[PDB]
Amino acid sequence: RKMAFPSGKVEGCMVQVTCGTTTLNGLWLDDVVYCPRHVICTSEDMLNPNYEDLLIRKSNHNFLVQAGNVQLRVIGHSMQNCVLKLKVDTANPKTPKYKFVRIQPGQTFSVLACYNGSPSGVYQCAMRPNFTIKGSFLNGSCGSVGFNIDYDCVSFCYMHHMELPTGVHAGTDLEGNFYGPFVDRQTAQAAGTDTTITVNVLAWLYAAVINGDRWFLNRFTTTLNDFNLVAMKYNYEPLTQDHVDILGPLSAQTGIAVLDMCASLKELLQNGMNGRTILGSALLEDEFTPFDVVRQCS
Amino acid sequence: FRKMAFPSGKVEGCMVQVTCGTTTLNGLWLDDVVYCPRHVICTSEDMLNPNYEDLLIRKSNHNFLVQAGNVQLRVIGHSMQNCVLKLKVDTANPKTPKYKFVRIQPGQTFSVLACYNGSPSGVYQCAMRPNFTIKGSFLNGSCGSVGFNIDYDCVSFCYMHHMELPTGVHAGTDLEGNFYGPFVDRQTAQAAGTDTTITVNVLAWLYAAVINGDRWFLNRFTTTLNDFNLVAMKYNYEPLTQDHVDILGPLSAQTGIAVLDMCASLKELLQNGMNGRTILGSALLEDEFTPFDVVRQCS
Questions:
Q1: Does B13 touch chain A if contact means CB atoms closer than 8 Å?
Q2: One domain, residues B81 and B221
Q3: How does strand B33-37 pair with strand B64-68?
Q4: Are residues A37 and A147 both part of a single domain?
Q5: What are the strands, taking DSSP E only, across B152-288?
Q6: What is the DSSP letter of A241?
Q7: Domain boundary among B156, B173, B190
Q8: E-assigned strands of A165-209?
Q9: Which element (helix H / strand E) includes A146?
Q10: Is A8–B5 a contact, with Cβ atoms under 8 angstroms apart?
């Protein structure tokens, strides 16, 4: 099952930001509120925004920040890439230990979907190789964040900006740099062709074996290069030696060598699932990392 | 569509640990009471056939170590309600949310905050199966973790974790300590009943498909409810109740597809099996999204 991190440390940081007719979510850490810079645009501005130009024309008073029922006064404002940083008169007393990280494609995070500064739901997402995420985000969700938690330190890695016409989602890191070749302009945008996260599919096949599902195994073995030739053919990402090492502990637990699991994956791509399921899925799942599997399989 | 858990913060602030002897499990601290599974009082020898009343008579307040983090909360009273121990403590939890204790029906979903030694580890959505088990991640140390729904800032607690069956599925109680299903808290051979498909949730998923414009399976037929239930059982689907029909009301109004017409559509899929065609990008029907889950994600 996908499992999210407990969200309380992030819930205490969510606020609402309004400018003009537009209300979205912001993240309140110490005395700064971070939010998507498109909060400043009208529906006409979004068609083609010169963001600086819109920004020079706003004052601190054009921003209304609400934390619960209490208003926070904006004393300053600046822009870092596609993120607005609103300095407020009150530091957040509930600020957790935190870091801003830019995540790698294939890594997972928890998303706290929020509307009007109020948390609604929590779920796991993976950063796709084409730098989109398959999330659940409706009107009003912009500025919701993604994060991982290590002990009590929250590593924020995503802030939500956009939904593409295909229904997938795009956003930035907390420095305001988009994942992927996207821009915060209301013009038609498509992602690059997506590919399957090979190391994650392998981690998930290990989870399946751990949970008793083993129909897909064989004694066929393969070399790493021969596996990658097939992976490339089927639009799977390359598997590196680093990935092989990362699968080590799962390989030890099941007694199935990484390259033997590669050989099983190769057969599944070439001759499909035969109307069978793995872990209840009719598809090969690639949104669990090795770390996500081992955290649940012990 | 994604399985989405509720934000867990309101429950995180209620999790404590409870130790009796060498056994540490999780407890739920609401106001000045901590709730936890009564088997915290058992030794390894007590578990094949525990006499819980006699084991508890032996215990005193001073035998229970309740800790919020590493901070001990003094126990000032203790009692047992069904399979739950209630420990009155000297401090009322300042983080107590508005809450209620509810007993859910099979098919209903809830979020689980899996915890170990009083420390929350992860959160995920669960459906109570018709056989009164849940599937999900509950490792050793998870007993006393709770399941809940949140409505308008009120936390409805519905599940407290107790056991893992030989098959790998999980069983537990409501917060009044009454088990869901035929299970008893003793280490005896216990088996889950045969499971079935949650019909009302499959119907909700079909409404979600229709909302999204995927509606090839809609037909011109209707059925009576009795006729549907008799057929559904031959396919290992649960029979529908009047309450199931009522909870489908909002989706039927939103789509204009009468509940009994959707039932006739589902009856056809079951009999004349979907020959290759998919629904919402899935060749299999989903049964773990409730009518409430669907309204939240579609609207």
A1: yes
A2: no
A3: unpaired
A4: yes
A5: 154-164, 170-173
A6: H
A7: B173
A8: 169-172
A9: strand A145-150
A10: no
Say if the Cβ atoms of A6 and B123 lie within 8 Å: yes
Closest Cα in chain B to A121? B6
CB A148 within 8 A of CB A109: yes
CATH number of the domain that residue A148 is part of? 2.40.10.10
Resolution (angstroms) stands at 1.4
Which of B4, B49, B171 shows the shortest CA–CA distance to A124?
B4
Question: What is the C-alpha to C-alpha distance for residues A266 and A80, in angstroms, rounded to an integer?
Answer: 45
Q: What tokens does A281 get?
A: 């899925």
- Taking an 8 Å cut-off on Cβ atoms, the answer to whether A5 and B283 are in contact is no
Edge to edge, what strands does the sheet with B71-73 contain? B71-73, B64-68, B15-20, B23-30, B33-37, B84-89, B75-81
Domain presence at residue A190? no
Residue A230 belongs to domain spanning: 198-296
Provide the shortest C-alpha distance from residue A88 to chain B (in Å): 24
Query: Residue B15 corresponds to which amino acid?
Result: M
Q: How many residues does chain B have?
A: 299
- As given in the structure block, the two tokens for residue B119 are 């420390």
The answer to whether residue B182 is domain-embedded is no
Q: Does A113 touch chain B (CB under 8 A)?
A: yes
Same domain, B265 and B148: no
Which of B12, B284, B297 is nearest residue A6 as measured by Cβ atoms?
B12
Method: X-ray
> Which of B146, B127, B129, B98 lies closest to B291 in space, CA to CA?
B127
The answer as to whether B134 is a domain residue is: yes
- The one-letter amino acid code at B214 reads D
Look at chain B and report how many structural domains it folds into.
2
Are A146 and A208 members of one domain?
Answer: no
A87 touches chain B (CB under 8 A): no
Residues of A with a catalytic annotation lie at 38, 142
A215 touches chain B (CB under 8 A): no
Answer left, alpha or beta for residue A149, where phi above 0 means left and psi between -120 and 50 means alpha.
beta
Is the same domain home to A37 and A129?
yes
Helices (H) and strands (E) counted in chain B, each on its own, are 8, 13
